[model samples]
Target: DTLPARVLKELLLYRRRYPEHRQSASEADEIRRIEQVQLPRIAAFIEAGEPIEFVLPAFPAKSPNPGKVLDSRPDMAERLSLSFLNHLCQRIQLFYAPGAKITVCSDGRVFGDLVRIGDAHISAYQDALRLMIEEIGATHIGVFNLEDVRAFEAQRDNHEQLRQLLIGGYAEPLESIRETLLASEEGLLLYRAITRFLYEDGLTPDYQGSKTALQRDAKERAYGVIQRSWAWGALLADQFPRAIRLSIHPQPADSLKFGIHMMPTRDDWLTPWHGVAVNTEDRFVLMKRSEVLELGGELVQINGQPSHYRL
Candidate 1:
């Protein structure tokens, strides 16, 4: 009985640092929330004496917006996050021995068209992530995607065809989707977050559309993106039924999917894909590239290429 209790207690050490979402709650409430939702799920695995496998469906392609990132590739922020995840597993192994591991369900292609990032860019970002894991010795961390499934692999090159087939197979109706995004509190949170990302990722020099027009488009695209994201999660659920779900997005206290904070950043929504890492002397923090430059932080390079920033 206490095996799972011990494991969960260990898990909370790192998780406690970053509270899941923007909520007004005390420490007791947060801990109770985690215990109620995550404990039983974690216990089921612990009882079997197997490695606790967590399925995190994130780490999609880097944001195409240059202000939020240095390039269309992974950098120090991703590396730091990967390192943290691996260590999280190793920490459990310190006593449990069975340990834990995480699989990153990279979902860029699932909503690539909706997000306006090209297929090539998604491929580049995913490849860099795989390489980053290898170089960092994060053997406990792994990456998977739609391409990993043979059924989806067949239609991968044809983006439009694959996207339509995916929607036809797994997507719920648009009407119900809209209702959730507009009606539910958590749903509205996702809607707003998706819209914000779409708006940010879409700004470019060639944009001729007025602010209102762009806002309208971003809002519509956010809805479509959430739809695809839902489908992707369903597919992952089917693929890894026993795996505990982890989300890159902020999840409410009672959410089934545990929201994992990737790094220390003032912005709750800031992600490695959407920002560059900066060494603040004390620790690493993620921030947009333009913001980093504005502070006069020196660009740090790895092998003659830009990697992160140092103030």
Candidate 2:
């Protein structure tokens, strides 16, 4: 009944990527406690149909000065809060419902601090969040982050209505696009460029455009590259008769010989190049680097064509 093995592994990998963010021994122990003890109890509570809630640990109060925050050592509070929230979400299936939702409450001041510290810190935090939905099997669960009530109130229009309330940044835009693409076409294109830069490095070129060009050609070229890749992905989906599908949930050990394909129809949004796709679809699909062992086999003819593909 080890429920959070995958979640713990992803956290460990994230810490490895950012050595400076490694947790202290006590923090590691606390994470262990949450995985080994707390999660099972939470799952049991849900099974018993009891009222329960998972409270996250407190984060440090936002500093008055942003410059001072930059000068100070990295805060472990944010890391701890992220770790707890990520693991807490692992048991979502225990309480899955038709119209249920999970609300994550936080003081708005911290986000101001986050935005001020510049994008790197925010990027790392966002990556943790990315892993929360991507690596952890928290599919179909809606998380609403009530960071600042005033900010929500300040925006008279519906623009800021779901700002921090959504889980993945990608989810918010796609959610809007699915609702009304006509008004959101420009927004969707902007998201495609931004997400491409965040996930795929080659798409974003250096800023070397002429200062006099009123509109920079470099920005245009970058979006052009991303748009081309999006089209290429759609073409690949149509050309390939069979595509290997992977799920967020881990496959059993005994099913080593079996390949998983959920359905024949492909989703262009979930291709290899998309950062959101890598985070949400492939984090668990492609197994860890060293642990993966592939078997070579003869190419076979299926549906009147011989295909050479590795599973």
Candidate 3:
């Protein structure tokens, strides 16, 4: 069920990368053949309600010349993946039909209908076509049509209401004026240096002439920017803080671990909450001398004891 569109997207890129993949003199002819013949036939087949096979795109690896490629095909029984593929094909088919006019918004990830997530289901991307096709029922469906009308006036009214609510709620738009607080000349300098490691630099730390090399990579860059912006805001008591700390309390039989923030040695555990001290959740506090060991920043031994067992 999912094979058709998945294979189509892959075939598109595969045809584009044919020159790099094979040492063939007919690479141009290969591209022309796929473009002029295979693609149109597949499109026509889908339009005619024929079962089609989708090709998966070859995601590039770390080394350009990583050994031979075998099939990385996924199971066809997986509902989520197949549903996503169907949604993508439908949207593409709808948009390109000869006289059918379609309305699409510029804002979204991947045409506002498809989303990509990691293998572990840890990340999310857009795949609206999947939902439209998979969730809508075969019982009955109604389609609406809008004729020549005041779309501009309706859009204006909607924008006005959206602007009022969006200003206070919702995730702030990326790289907009809303992010001006994160935009300092000093910080932007560091941000550009860090992002270079991500986009153009290929996640290298010390590759000097490459636009991809930088001190920190993607996750590190995200952590750094967040930490730097909140550095002063996260200030604890007037003392040096440990980078890591682990706290344990035994309840007769079992032990519980508390991962606390790093802070200076002089700071005291004024009070104990579930995993922290005092009502300082709102206001960040410095760490104490005891927390250095558990946070992965350091290892400590107390009074020549093994320090493995916490009292």
Candidate 4:
């Protein structure tokens, strides 16, 4: 829920920087902030599945001015992003949902394609879920060790190492954030997907309450949607071995791939941007600016097409 709130806050910041009515260099730059800054950190978090919390300064008090509030005194927005991401990396924990149940331990042997449930120990996995449920009820949300048995110990160890690397001190802030954001892209997509799911499922809260409370509710609704989606994904994973999943992308995939390119003019550096691109192979590509370009120019064009423009 806090993650969604943070996202909403960030969205407002971007809007204030570049009101939908106009565009200019003084508006705001999203490209550089994303590519050179956000992605790296996102990558780190994704690889580690680290959760982070931040005390946003411009959420309720400042509506569509998160960027203004953070950057007013100084370039604090960028710094704050780094700080929160770093903190996330440092706080890696297993996030198993409460009330989850799984069927494990079947007595029947499966040498062929036919698999049947025979004297299976549903309670074993149910015990795990029940434990998580108790813990979650106590803490609302917490992390734990998802690994069990000797074979999984190595995987657990490797994941732990990855988490350390994600949060550990890196020499360059820009590089760290860029990778983190790249990793976080998946999470952002999941968040959006869950938000859509809630809308489709009629789980939306009244949207006309206090603006801040409404905003918070919007985020919570999205989180609930995502949580349910996550449970569904996990349920499917037992049947589909390839169905690995995660949540926590700093930017939205659609916006990264398509939205950025759709724009007639894009900032020199893209940050807090979303886009999607369709290639000849039908693979939708998502990308963010890796370096500073210019403010007033077309960002997307037919590959061979050329235009007379200057930075």
**How close is every model to the real structure, measured as TM-score?**
0.91, 0.23, 0.18, 0.20
Please report, as a residue range, the 10-residue window in candidate 3 with the lowest summed lDDT.
Answer: 62-71
Using TM-score as the yardstick, the better of models 2 and 3 is 2
Q: List, residue by residue over 161-207, the lDDT tens digit for candidate 1.
A: 77777788888887878987777677887788789888887775456
Residues 50-156 of candidate 4: C-alpha lDDT, one tens digit per residue: 33322111110111122112111111122222233332323332231111111221111110111111112222322433353343333222222223323345554
- The Cα local distance difference test for each model comes to 0.80, 0.30, 0.27, 0.28
**Residue 303 CA error for candidate 4 (Å)?**
11
lDDT of 3 by residue, 1-311 (tens): 24334433443431212112246555455444444434454555456654342322111111111111111111111222233333444554553332111121111111111111222121111132223324542111111111111332343324333223323332333344225435554344334433432332232223345443433344344433333222211221011121110121101111111112122112222111101211123433323213422443232243542212121
Top-TM-score structure, candidate number: 1
* Residue-by-residue lDDT tens digits, candidate 2, 201-234: 2222243444434134334343433332233223
Q: Candidate 1: which stretches are off by over 4 Å? A: 10-23, 205-209
Ranking by lDDT: 1, 2, 4, 3
Which structure is stronger by TM-score: 1 or 2?
Answer: 1
Q: What is the overall TM-score of model 2 with all chains considered together? A: 0.23
Which of candidates 2 and 4 reaches a greater TM-score? 2
RMSD of 4: 22.2
Tell me how far the alpha carbon of residue 119 in candidate 4 is from the true structure, in angstroms, after superposition: 40
Candidate 1 to native Cα RMSD, angstroms: 2.5
